[PDB]
Symmetry: C3
């Protein structure tokens, strides 16, 4: 009967998964068939648990997950970080494969002498920050191989746990410098690369990492190629010296949308992933290009992060994200980004982060160190981050580290830490109940309002702050404290004195204990014309150890200011116009009030004159 066949077909659309009991292998076959067409797999209502197994694909996945569908199992889309011809896994420990290792045991017969070989951490280890390698890739050449060992031509830069050793499909050493902001890489790569391929550029000898470190890399998409060189779709973010150029195998697109719920989604190694309008309890996006992720909610799964983004390159968008429910024992964050240059971030609202010991679990954290790598967060635009204090002994809530050339605005709710940033603007910071902590910023502009503030180090920076209170702990009774730095963020030079920082502080604490500004370990601090405090305070300017060339413009501080011969005042052409008579052009100067009288003479008196000729007045001249 054709009618029965027709109705059976109508009741069971291809590409519509509606049986929660679909086997893992049948679900995989659905996804394989959809990918041949490039179309979506859609789901009917229900609670799907996939026999408790992860569902992993290495090809494009386009899911429509509607309201009423819960995909309650791990879904992992995983492309190839480096495209490989062969690989040998290993169970050596980091102690058996320490930094500088050149000989690795295993069956390496098929690895030709002189070929390029790469080494990565095994897929069943997280490595360790203790030997500075949780995410590292190393490239070198084969000096010798046998069915018992391989000899590398240069030693491994870091220790590896469970090293996996492989031959890249296409990997070439560049001789010379690829400068940041370039778009053309000279050379003949036509034997290995095509338009649309994504390459990894792995620095070896350059120093354009955070703190001047040499471990960093970036991904780029080839937009043109000929025998003279390749052009890439976005300009280089970092300067590389003698890098490796390596072909990746990122998956060509993937998407997850629809309004339903996913327990755990991992999107790794994808070119142009989209994740939008879903509830994802745990979301991980890593080693991707041109991401677009937004309108996401995430309740967490009790892991140290709930949503994180790692090594995302190109021009990404991250918007309208509510993330929560993370629990950590070491530093981590509900919403966490690590080295995502060029990303636009708009409107993130994290909350309910918890730490169970002595370290933090932040609401929002942008970090540039993922051992071994120190890739700058170059050129990010961040607007609209609303936080609350972690449920933690650590009250820090929002932490930005390793940003350069970034525009940052509208940060509110809980304690902000800005650390190790360069040439960036941070405005509309609104955290009136909290400390604002600032460390080792170079050429930054910081403005907004807080309870109290701490500046450690910093160079050529401006701090334009309204402060409502004073410190309670290491900054006890001080509205703004400045102290020693540690490291210049771009050069990595150890540096304890801050230099040339401008302070425009309006301090409104009504406490009789308040010390408006307490400054130490600073060269040429500048106290600007915008400084204000009120006369209930205890002290206006306390200068401590190692302050040199302190500089002041006329301001509206009301209580004690420390003295000394090193003060530099304002400088001007044109004089000044003291526009007044004895009433309102009397200049207070040491123990006198000095004024020009109505008859043109210069006078002085030890108390403010109530006439042009007070009885305690004297004529200076003529």
């Amino acid at each position: 009967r054709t009618i029965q066949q027709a109705i059976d077909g109508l009741e069971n659309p291809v590409h519509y998964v509606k049986d929660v009991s679909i086997t893992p292998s049948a679900l995989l076959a659905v996804a394989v068939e959809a990918a041949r067409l490039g179309r979506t797999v859609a789901f009917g209502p229900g609670h799907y648990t996939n026999q408790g197994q992860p569902f992993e694909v290495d090809f494009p996945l386009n899911l429509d997950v509607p309201v009423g569908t819960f995909l309650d199992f791990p879904i992992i889309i995983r492309g190839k970080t480096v495209k490989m011809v062969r690989s040998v896994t290993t169970n050596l420990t980091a102690a058996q494969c320490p930094a500088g290792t050149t000989v690795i045991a295993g069956d390496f017969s098929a690895f030709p002498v002189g070929s390029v070989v790469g080494v990565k951490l095994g897929d069943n280890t997280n490595g360790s920050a203790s030997y500075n390698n949780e995410a590292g890739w190393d490239f070198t050449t084969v000096a010798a191989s046998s069915n018992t060992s391989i000899t590398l031509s240069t030693g491994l830069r870091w220790a590896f746990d469970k090293p996996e050793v492989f031959t890249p499909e296409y990997a070439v050493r560049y001789s010379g410098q690829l400068s940041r902001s370039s778009y053309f890489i000279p050379g003949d790569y036509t034997s290995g690369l095509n338009v649309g391929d994504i390459i990894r550029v792995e620095n070896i000898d350059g120093t354009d990492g955070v703190h001047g470190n040499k471990e960093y890399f970036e991904m780029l998409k080839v937009s043109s190629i000929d025998s003279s060189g390749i052009t890439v779709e976005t300009r280089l973010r970092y300067t590389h010296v003698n890098p490796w150029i390596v072909k990746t195998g990122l998956v060509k697109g993937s998407s997850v949308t629809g309004g339903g719920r996913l327990k755990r989604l991992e999107v790794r190694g994808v070119d142009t992933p989209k994740v939008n309008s879903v509830d994802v309890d745990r979301l991980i996006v890593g080693l991707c290009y041109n991401i677009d992720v937004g309108e996401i909610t995430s309740r967490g799964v009790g892991e140290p992060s709930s949503v994180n983004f790692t090594f995302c390159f190109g021009r990404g968008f991250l918007y309208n994200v509510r993330a929560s429910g993370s629990v950590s024992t070491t530093d981590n964050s509900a919403l966490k980004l690590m080295s995502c240059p060029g990303l636009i971030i708009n409107n993130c609202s994290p909350h309910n982060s918890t730490s169970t010991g002595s370290q933090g679990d932040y609401g929002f954290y942008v970090d540039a160190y993922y051992s071994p790598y120190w890739c700058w967060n170059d050129g990010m635009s961040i607007n609209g981050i609303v936080t609350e204090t972690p449920r933690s002994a650590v009250t820090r809530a929002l932490w930005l580290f390793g940003l350069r050339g970034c525009s940052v605005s509208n940060l509110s709710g809980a304690q902000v830490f800005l650390q190790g940033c360069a040439k960036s603007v941070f405005s509309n910071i609104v955290t009136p109940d909290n400390l604002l902590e600032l460390r080792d910023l170079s050429g930054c502009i910081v403005s907004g309002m807080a309870n109290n503030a701490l500046v450690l180090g910093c160079w050529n920076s401006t701090f334009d702050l309204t402060l409502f209170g004073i410190g309670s702990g290491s900054n006890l009774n001080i509205a703004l404290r400045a102290g020693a730095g540690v490291t210049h963020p771009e050069t990595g030079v150890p540096t304890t004195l801050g230099k040339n920082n401008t302070f425009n502080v309006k301090s409104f604490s009504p406490s009789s204990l308040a010390v408006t500004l307490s400054i130490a370990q600073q060269e040429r601090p500048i106290f600007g014309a915008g400084c204000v405090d009120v006369d209930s305070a205890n002290k206006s300017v306390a200068l401590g150890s190692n302050v040199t060339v302190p500089t002041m413009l006329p301001l509206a501080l009301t209580k004690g200011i420390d003295s000394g011969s090193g003060w530099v005042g304002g400088r001007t052409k044109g004089g000044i116009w003291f526009d007044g008579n004895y009433r309102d052009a009397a200049v207070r100067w040491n123990g006198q009030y000095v004024w020009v009288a109505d008859n043109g003479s210069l006078k002085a008196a030890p108390t403010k004159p109530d006439s042009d000729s007070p009885s305690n007045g004297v004529v200076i001249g003529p």
Copy 2:
């Protein structure tokens, strides 16, 4: 008949009419309700075919999740109301009484209350059939107390009603407990044993009684919170408290678990009330109301209005919400209201709203955008909002005010443009990138705020510890006639509620570029220690640069670039500095003008003075003050 026993007719009928798809514009209200009930059983969407649906003219109301897909070509032309339980109740009695029959302080209410046990918790709300009245301070209030007596003809409350109630509805909460002590703002753990009534995922109402953390120090305010863990020692909530409460009631709500409306089509009227995590996105809604919800997500909305005082409202939305890409218009009011109106939505991120075509009939206004903290009786702070990107136009009204923000604290606000802004009664907030060059900028009773941008002219009333960094292009035409920036008296400190008429410690950095020969750059009255900063500029066509009115004390000035008259007096305070100043020049460019002299250090090191600006180091009208 088919292999599974069904006839062909049933199989095609089901394919041509899926249970969750509504394509018949003539579907009855009862049949539509049955569709919605069945979709809620499966947690899934009801989708519509094209057509103009009127539901026999009837409102369509549900008290369970509704998830609608309303595509382009579908017009749901009937009210749709999703209504959860603001407080979960085990019994309730409605009355017919007016507010005059149930005044403030009432303890005895007529009706059949025989099932209300003495000593149980009893609540009173306005009936759903009244809006109350701001005239007795109660449009939205809830009161909780205990039963002191009950019978089949009246009930006696242990404490008198806080406000009068119209049509009071008297009820037993399913779970309500009185807390003894303070719950501080920014806490996340509430001590006590709530395990007999609460579970993880429940939403609770915390109703303040004795605390003063409302706007103006008022005692009427509340918030909602979601329970994230519970044990016999206390509950934790998934967002920290926004307000400090003292001896509050802790009350279990019955918010609906989710709901959504999406799809590209058009709805005449959508009310989303008492929903945990509602989503409304990518629809045209003529009248949208979202009220008493948690963790909202509303965006990509257009609204043409229905000629009512507001077109789009958000009221009492708690947790962490998003509101974005909204175009609203078409409202008509007789008393103050707004096309897009928000009342007490702490923690909300608002991005890109573009209201227009708002109209008022009388002497009050119909604003484009209004964030308000007073919804009588409540004064819940708009604490911790982030607002970016609001474009307004002048209402069609006697009142030119277009964008009004009241009762914000700890808020980051930026990018407000197009028509007249009023900031009122805000604290510890930043308002930047204000761009309203054709309009007055009005600022009243701000405490610890920073306000920057550009306008035609400006008015500062009161304010404490605030900074006004403004470029102004014109001068006032009415109550601020010919003044670029006027400062005058305040009314009330916003946090403490203390009546206060003098502003204090405000910084003014005003660049005033009106070319009018009538312009007065700054006209300052009723201010203690106003500070005229180094950023002040005007131009020498002005009539006057600084006029000082009544009750100005300790006026303070830093060296600046104002060019016309400045009022004199012995109370002026100048800038203070270490290091002296370097007057870097000789007689031509280090001559200091001082009263009627020019004073300079001559090339031989002597100090000279002359009554006109010196054209040489030794003018014939020069005098040596000394060597």
Copy 3:
């Protein structure tokens, strides 16, 4: 084999081939049009199954609403053009005349115009087969006049054509009336009786003739407005007028009522022209053009380009639009153009645009982001836009300028980063959070603007009543060699159009941190009353702090933190203050450096001077000025 009328095969065939689902990539252009016409009757979507559709290589053009659902896996690889009527017409005559044959001032046009009555309104547009030419100032112009003579061989216009036209098309509008007098910007009511030609919901074109409210005071500008109410006394419009018009034409348009393209898939080329409220969202569009639309909503778009001078552009969009989350790339030009290009879009909110990979072949540029107000002949202001979040990179071109904003007024702009910004010919706008530390920041002919952020170095040309608050890290390498901030001559005031070479009353607060021994912090010429504010800073490695060039008058300085040479002269003006100053110290830290002396008040109250900074209160080189 029957159901209730229909055969079972009918029903099965209907279900296997639903009528609004296009799933056959072989569908003919005629059949696809018929699907679109049927959907428009219902106002519903056309949805596509997966596949690569090429429409037999034909453009697909409609002049009625189109609502497409284009899902992931669908590629519509052919041009799709939705085109409403810019002006509704009742007759039109096309010609093949060249611009030399129809020069500016032309009153007589050959052709069969026997159907055009003397005294009726006639309009002239460029033919649809021409682009015109900027060389005779007309790529987009419309002219309206009356018929003075007509016959089967020519028409005579009552007034000469304002510009030359190539292939002029001559037509009678359906409804066009001349307004006598001024329609002021910001108004909403247009007096007169238009009921014979207009209804609520119509969109009108207001074409200025005699007003001067264009950029540079030019007379060529127009806007579109939607009628929200009408009676016999006048019309009301949904949004207030953006421009002031004098003796304009009021012309009825035929904009299409709605259209939309969504769904996740890919389109080769989409042109949306003459549409009331188009929506384009969540699609990949290689080339996207949106022009002459009202209340646009375009967002979540990616565009890889087609190698044309622009990839995505918006022209003449009115009302209240949104543009958001756009990644555009792949443009290639030989004359100025931009990957993402906007021309005259007043009132538009723009949020989060990330253009890249733009290329130009010769001496002009191909920018990443460009907002322009000149599209010949028109100079319509970009009035009241809000722009936030633009990330650029340097074009692959000899021109390094990457982001160019021209002809903005009343705009709030923030968060511009990544590559070289040019702000030109803007008025009464704020531009903040500019972060381009590797690049020149170029600023020309700004009036009443506030510009803040950080760059490598900066150039200010002209400008009036503006503020430049900048941190600079380097110095120029070419035209601005060795200078951190250079100021020079302007050209034109942007609002009045008055030719003006001197800037006036600009405030410079520059913090310059170049460590180069060549650095000149400020090099100022062609400026009246430049103000060097109290926020200026440099470091003492620099060569020079302030170099004054030709035509600097009334240079004004407040006490600041510049450390190297400042040019001298008698025209310097210092700060002004009430209350004196408190030099709070003794000989150590209240010594005033003054010409070649240090002056201080000694502990005994006498005034002293010494030629070196004093190391005691009575140095051996000191002198008592007086007691």
